[PDB]
């Protein structure tokens, strides 16, 4: 029973989208995530063209389209595999979606209300916890060359 924890996980992910996607402050201080957000901001800069091309012919500026992107995150693990690279790809993609909605408040706010939960499920809370959760991801991001 990780019931006291699920709200905080969704909120931490939303703060990644707020910080990396929208360059704005979040609700609570998450020190472990500072290097993770820097890493994501770097992926977004160095791989912008790749992500923008993923959505090239996708009409995602709608609630149905945002939902489909959340369903896409869930399907990343369709082959039964998860790994840190995929987790970071999910978080980076969510941040890019927020960024691209930054001039459409209602859709931006919708994305921030649903994509964090989709990303939480897509990563896999059990998978993530068994690997040290955010402390694990912070160590991956700091110890390893891109």
């Amino acid at each position: 029973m990780d019931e006291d924890v699920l709200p905080g996980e969704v909120l931490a992910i939303e703060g990644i989208f707020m910080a990396c996607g929208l360059n704005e402050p979040e609700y609570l201080y998450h020190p472990l995530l500072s290097p993770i957000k820097l890493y994501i901001t770097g992926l977004m800069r160095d791989k912008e063209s790749l992500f923008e091309a993923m959505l090239a012919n996708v009409r995602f500026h709608s609630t149905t389209g945002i939902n489909q992107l959340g369903l896409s995150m869930l399907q990343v693990s369709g082959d039964g595999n998860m790994n840190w690279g995929r987790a970071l790809a999910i978080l980076t993609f969510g941040s890019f979606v927020a960024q691209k909605l930054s001039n459409e408040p209602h859709l931006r706010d919708f994305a921030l209300a649903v994509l964090p939960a989709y990303a939480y499920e897509a990563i896999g809370p059990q998978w993530f916890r068994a690997r040290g959760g955010w402390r694990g991801l912070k160590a991956y991001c700091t110890q390893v060359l891109t």
């Binding site: 992926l43 993923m54 996708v58 489909q68 896409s72 399907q75 790994n83 690279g85 995929r86």
Partner: peptide, 28 residues
């Protein structure tokens, strides 16, 4: 054009990007 096709293709590309970026110890 199908929602299912759209989702499958995006997910595949995301998984491929993730797999290429991954720096976890690989399988033998």
């Amino acid at each position: 054009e199908s929602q299912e096709d759209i989702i499958r293709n995006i997910a595949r590309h995301l998984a491929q990007v993730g797999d290429s970026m991954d720096r976890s110890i690989p399988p033998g």
